Amino acid sequence: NPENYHFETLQVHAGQTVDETGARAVPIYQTTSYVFKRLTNPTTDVVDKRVAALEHGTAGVTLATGSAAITAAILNIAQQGDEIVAANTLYGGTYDLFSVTLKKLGITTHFVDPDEPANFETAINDHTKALYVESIGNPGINLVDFEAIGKIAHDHGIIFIVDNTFGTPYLVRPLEHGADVVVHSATKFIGGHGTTMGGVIVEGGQFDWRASGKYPDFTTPDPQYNGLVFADLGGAAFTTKVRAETLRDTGATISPFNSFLLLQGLESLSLRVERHVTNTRKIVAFLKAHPKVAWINYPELEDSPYHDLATKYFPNGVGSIFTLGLTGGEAAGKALIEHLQLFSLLANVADAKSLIIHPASTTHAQLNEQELLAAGVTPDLIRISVGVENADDLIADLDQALAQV
Amino acid sequence: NPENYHFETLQVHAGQTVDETGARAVPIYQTTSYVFKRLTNPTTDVVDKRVAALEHGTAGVTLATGSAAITAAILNIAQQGDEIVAANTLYGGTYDLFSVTLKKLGITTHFVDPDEPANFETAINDHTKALYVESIGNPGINLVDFEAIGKIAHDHGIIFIVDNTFGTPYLVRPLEHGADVVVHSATKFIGGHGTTMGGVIVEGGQFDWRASGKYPDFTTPDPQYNGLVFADLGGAAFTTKVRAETLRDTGATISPFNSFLLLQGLESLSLRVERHVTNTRKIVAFLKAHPKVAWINYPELEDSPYHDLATKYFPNGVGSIFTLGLTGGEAAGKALIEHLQLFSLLANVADAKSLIIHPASTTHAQLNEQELLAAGVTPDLIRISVGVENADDLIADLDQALAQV
Amino acid sequence: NPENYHFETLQVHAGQTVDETGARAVPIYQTTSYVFKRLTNPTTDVVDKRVAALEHGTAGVTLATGSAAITAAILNIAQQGDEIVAANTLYGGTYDLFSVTLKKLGITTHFVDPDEPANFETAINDHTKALYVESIGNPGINLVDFEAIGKIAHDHGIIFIVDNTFGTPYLVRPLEHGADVVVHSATKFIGGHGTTMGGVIVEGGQFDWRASGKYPDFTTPDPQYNGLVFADLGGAAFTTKVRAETLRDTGATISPFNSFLLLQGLESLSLRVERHVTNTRKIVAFLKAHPKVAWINYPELEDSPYHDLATKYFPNGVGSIFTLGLTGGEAAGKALIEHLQLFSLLANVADAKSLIIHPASTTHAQLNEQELLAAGVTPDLIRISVGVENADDLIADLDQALAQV
Amino acid sequence: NPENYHFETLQVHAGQTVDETGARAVPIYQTTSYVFKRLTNPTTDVVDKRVAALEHGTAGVTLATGSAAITAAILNIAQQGDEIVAANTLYGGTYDLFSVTLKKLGITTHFVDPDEPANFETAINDHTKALYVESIGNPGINLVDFEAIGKIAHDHGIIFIVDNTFGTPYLVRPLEHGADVVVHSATKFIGGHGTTMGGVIVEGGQFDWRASGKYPDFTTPDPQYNGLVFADLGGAAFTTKVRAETLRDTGATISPFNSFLLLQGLESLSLRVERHVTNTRKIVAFLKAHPKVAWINYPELEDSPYHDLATKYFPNGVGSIFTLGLTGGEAAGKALIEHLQLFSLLANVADAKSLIIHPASTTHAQLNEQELLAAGVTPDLIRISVGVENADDLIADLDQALAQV
Ligand code: PRO
Ligand code: PRO
């Protein structure tokens, strides 16, 4: 950011240049190949650089989905015999990736209670290659002490990876709080409209591969690449290795059309996030005062166990996804869904449309109470993802539905 | 809007249904035909209904461009021998349409000073079929008294057409202040990112064709449509006639791809417009106080000749396009452009990126001072279209550029 | 075409160049504007040039639809008080355009029996600005003597316009047989898959505007174009005027997305048309010999009134759209449709999927018998559009359906 | 294929249904989620079913790229400690995948000479989970005895996987000749125009998982899917497991937009492949008679050792990619490229445009001659990918270039 632009200017402009035609919008390079006079796609290139700029990182790379970005970030530093230490409050898709697919390939993940950063240090051994957390947990809506976990990682010479999907770089930039790599499911807030899948890896460029000694593939001349040393790429070491290795081999590439649509959502990102957050604050204030609401999980509430972490790390708010339970338990939460007119029942989050789900009667309908709890779910649990509709319309819809339960 | 929803809910939801797949986003029906078991495209149909709902109209129809939407609106009610009374401050593209293309076809337009609504009535005769104005003039940034012009039209049994491109329905809804038809170049604020062309016509549904008697094509059964009387369609009479006649015959149809991108922009429309407006207020306040600014045309300024109209009709602000002139006149305006690094030099408006133009040295570089004046431009005139970048960055760009002129 | 490339090379390469990125595919320039340093979109520009090259023309211009292309081609040379002489066997949409929309605007069209070229001559007067035909008429599937009609137009110093939608430039190039302008509904064969609307105008560059004297708007310097004389643009005179005038004013622009899809179809154009034709020859042969078929209109049949025109102008065949009647009349035609499993019932032509329609029981169902024959339709008439499925499969579908009729 | 359609009918129709709107083309479901009343995309679903039908398989699944399709097919049946026996004449990208990314994850691949099928049996042990070949090798253009290799695989209770990218289902259907799984880079011929990446996996439904014993993950109830036994899904077992496991976890999903473009290329697939082949036959015949051509690898040549495999398995030809060497060696090859006007210099294959590359002076320019020989490349080797331009134009281009060499 040589120009010292603010967030809103970067989300509209960063990474974008004007080609020979003068086209003011980024052209969609729906091409597979380039005539020899490029390894990367000129549309996706803008996404790489823009998301990196917004996270105050040094370089980025974009993939088909959040899952593919997380997969590539782990495979970039971990192989058979290596280990990861991860928060045990992970999104279900990431937990399945860690506990099934990657485990089958010789990578062991230890899951720890992230409420105490020392739980990470306990699980580190000579095989650990990264610590892994999410900025805002799902479905616990729990926060973590980025700086304390990053210090533990760095004292042991290993990198700290944060999935910032729920936060977006507008609410928190984990690279400035101890993380070395940030990943996103751009499918959520970055795209903004429930249309387009994508994933992004951003590196921060402040991790000394050579001082660490635990990443020899970064410090050793790779004859596959004419003796290139990835650590000599500085702030592009991690993402160039992804590009040159895991992405080259396994091909979870994003379509240029999808990149185009992510660029459009990036140009309005903070405007939408601000309204997501203000809508959520109003909705949470209404629900917390409602006599039929038994509990709410939103870390910005003064009595939340995560309130101090919210004050420290989330000065613009803690996003627009939260959970709650009604005094009528599982039956009331089921009945609430049925009477809502504006909230859509589905399993996704971070649409411009408000969404709601009662996992115990839908996505987790096969599980008993103990199995539900193992997945961080209770029979009364309801998750809400607040959209950018008019907040008074959303509150009236919740108000009338609560009157039915 | 039976449930009585606010603007922001409508921009996210209006016109959109969930089909048999449950898909939460509107599919892109890139199809030319439909198996006989519909007449309209299901993607574009959402645009039709959403923009109509936002203008508090009864029905809408979408076309390839604002130019096409304006052309179809006029041809819907005017043929050889008919007349139109329009403001003489019209956008140049619309002026060329009226004074060249439609004049060749036997439609005569009278251009009157819109500052006094009585000038419209002076030009009305027995062949007049509509009055036509823009919500906010280009490049005069001039306002007009909607309700006074509408009463003149309706006292003479003719409809009032308003191009609301520069306002959007978030800043003014002309159908609530005497207009019968609103047209948009959706290319501008509705799309929001300078990627996608489209035009929209919305009707208000409160014009009595039969009582007027001046539109026999709306009141007479047509054997082409098997005895249909367009006036019997009530709030869909005007747009159905466009669909059934001018659009069917002349084919300025929008791509379903473009409609999909317009829907995306609609879902963030008020969020963007609000930021356009707050950015513009800040920039205008900074320019009003700058020693090298000689004048500024922005109707919200208390000393503007249009300030009363702004307070009457524009309670949320008067948009993000304005003009100014510098103390160094033509040469200073010519020099300012070369020194700006964030604003983009081009002839468009209403992008997410901030734009500027000094017409006398670019688009109008070939005209002498008299020819310039005939086009609404002076040698010193600069036009700015404010984007949604951070306002401090934009003000800093202007400040460092003004320092060099 | 300086290096004298053949049709198949041009459909893959013509108009396409490699930009600074080396992208081998044409990027999609989904942009509304260009930094001032442009009305021509770089994606659509390739369509312009490629279709013009395939028709052996000098310049092209692309619009939203075939209807828009036809409208602009007529408005480009005809205004109020002017006249057109057209075949009375026109596509229905074109008939409606000429007889309703353009008539309302002072352009009079006389419809003459095109079977006799002198019928065009006898309708010419001092107001006539063009002769207009289609290469293959619909629903009659009738051919016309291009060179005879073209000589007539030129002896009177007016242009000859041919709608070559049904032919494509692969089967006939009317600009080589007396036409001055060719228009296409690119929606049909050029796109090839029933997904994408567009229209194209191609000029031949062999008409002497000055020697004619009947087109002063082409030869007088125009002050709103800095004294430009359109005739001085040579083989780009007609399409530049459309671009600078009718298209500029009325805005029937094509989306860059649609242009990109038309380029894809063009790259397979002759391969698909060849198979359309061979499939149709096989199917017509089967139906002509079938005891339940009463008559078939396909001009390549030796007993057709049009066979001589087919041999002269259509050495590669006469397309894939034909009509037929069954011995069981209307009832048998409608039962045929009911029993078919592979043909799709709809009103379109030139999909990759085979299509069929019985107009008297659908698109013309509320019309008596004098009604229909005025529209070239009889109660028994069936129209088939042959796709590129396997010919044996289509014949087996026809055979099993006919067995039940 | 319940009604026994031929290839050309399937490539137009298979997998496609008409929804409630009647839309004749497949809508683009650019959506991330679906309201609960899955997440299989309805656009991509048509690709899955169409490619499976064309390969005469029972089920398919589509991924972001061919690389991702191959990755998922291997991970579907191999984990840490497992082994693959592949031909040593692999596409370079696939060699890198097996030899780098997968080897790091505990999957060992043995590479054997595929000219002798016994070489596959030699390398089989109790860790082997599949045999892997390409239908037409690169860059040797070598063929393999599908039935012989398939018998070895099944004698050992393991599956046989064939990458049919170079063949397409039009030229050979390995599932009918002993293969159990066919993968495609749909980026190449299926897309057809160098615009759109994709990969597809098709299973044949004939492999008895329970009888084999070597795939316990297919026969054991999976608690992650409520006791599902994947083998119980019959001819959907392999691809459902990919969908539910590897693709779920690692997320190399295809964009609905890319699926839409693949559908369009499928509707013309056999038409393009036929022209690719006939062009290549003409070009190879010309090159083989040319005095400056020292050697040509094309399996259909009468002196090719692969001629009998071409006759047995490729009745419609052996594709449009081949290699040759010139009498002037490396310097002559380099010069040929510089003088060609129609062939595009780049590293890809199977565009509609003809493509050419001389690896020794471009992609592998940094390798010495014995590094070259490791990759099956000689200093004189040229690879040509023949497009669908006019064959005489292409022959003329080759002739004038050779004359300067
Ligand atoms: O403003 C927005 O958020 C949308 C995103 C896609 C195009 N415009
Ligand atoms: O026919 C074809 O090959 C192309 C593929 C994309 C659209 N049409």
JSON list of C-alpha atoms and ligand atoms in Angstrom, two decimals, chain A residues 191-193 260-261 264-269 272, chain B residues 191-193 195 261 264-269 272, ligand 1:
[
{"chain": "A", "resi": 191, "resn": "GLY", "atom": "CA", "xyz": [-18.84, -12.47, -2.40]},
{"chain": "A", "resi": 192, "resn": "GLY", "atom": "CA", "xyz": [-21.69, -11.12, -0.31]},
{"chain": "A", "resi": 193, "resn": "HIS", "atom": "CA", "xyz": [-24.74, -12.45, -2.18]},
{"chain": "A", "resi": 260, "resn": "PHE", "atom": "CA", "xyz": [-15.00, -11.30, -11.34]},
{"chain": "A", "resi": 261, "resn": "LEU", "atom": "CA", "xyz": [-17.97, -11.69, -8.98]},
{"chain": "A", "resi": 264, "resn": "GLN", "atom": "CA", "xyz": [-17.67, -6.88, -7.34]},
{"chain": "A", "resi": 265, "resn": "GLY", "atom": "CA", "xyz": [-18.46, -7.90, -3.76]},
{"chain": "A", "resi": 266, "resn": "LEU", "atom": "CA", "xyz": [-15.09, -6.62, -2.57]},
{"chain": "A", "resi": 267, "resn": "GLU", "atom": "CA", "xyz": [-15.91, -3.18, -3.97]},
{"chain": "A", "resi": 268, "resn": "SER", "atom": "CA", "xyz": [-18.81, -2.97, -1.47]},
{"chain": "A", "resi": 269, "resn": "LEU", "atom": "CA", "xyz": [-17.36, -5.14, 1.33]},
{"chain": "A", "resi": 272, "resn": "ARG", "atom": "CA", "xyz": [-22.21, -4.39, 3.57]},
{"chain": "B", "resi": 191, "resn": "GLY", "atom": "CA", "xyz": [-25.42, -1.74, -11.35]},
{"chain": "B", "resi": 192, "resn": "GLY", "atom": "CA", "xyz": [-23.02, 0.25, -9.16]},
{"chain": "B", "resi": 193, "resn": "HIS", "atom": "CA", "xyz": [-19.63, -0.90, -10.49]},
{"chain": "B", "resi": 195, "resn": "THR", "atom": "CA", "xyz": [-19.69, -3.29, -15.50]},
{"chain": "B", "resi": 261, "resn": "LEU", "atom": "CA", "xyz": [-25.43, -8.45, -12.31]},
{"chain": "B", "resi": 264, "resn": "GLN", "atom": "CA", "xyz": [-26.44, -8.10, -7.32]},
{"chain": "B", "resi": 265, "resn": "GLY", "atom": "CA", "xyz": [-26.09, -4.31, -7.39]},
{"chain": "B", "resi": 266, "resn": "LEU", "atom": "CA", "xyz": [-29.71, -3.84, -6.27]},
{"chain": "B", "resi": 267, "resn": "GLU", "atom": "CA", "xyz": [-29.02, -5.95, -3.17]},
{"chain": "B", "resi": 268, "resn": "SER", "atom": "CA", "xyz": [-26.52, -3.28, -2.00]},
{"chain": "B", "resi": 269, "resn": "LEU", "atom": "CA", "xyz": [-28.12, -0.23, -3.64]},
{"chain": "B", "resi": 272, "resn": "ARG", "atom": "CA", "xyz": [-23.81, 2.28, -1.77]},
{"chain": "E", "resi": 1, "resn": "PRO", "atom": "O1", "xyz": [-22.55, -4.37, -4.90]},
{"chain": "E", "resi": 1, "resn": "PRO", "atom": "C1", "xyz": [-22.46, -5.60, -4.77]},
{"chain": "E", "resi": 1, "resn": "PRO", "atom": "O2", "xyz": [-22.28, -6.01, -3.61]},
{"chain": "E", "resi": 1, "resn": "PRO", "atom": "C2", "xyz": [-22.67, -6.59, -5.95]},
{"chain": "E", "resi": 1, "resn": "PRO", "atom": "C3", "xyz": [-21.68, -7.75, -5.89]},
{"chain": "E", "resi": 1, "resn": "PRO", "atom": "C4", "xyz": [-21.78, -8.33, -7.37]},
{"chain": "E", "resi": 1, "resn": "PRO", "atom": "C5", "xyz": [-22.04, -7.08, -8.27]},
{"chain": "E", "resi": 1, "resn": "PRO", "atom": "N1", "xyz": [-22.45, -6.05, -7.30]}
]
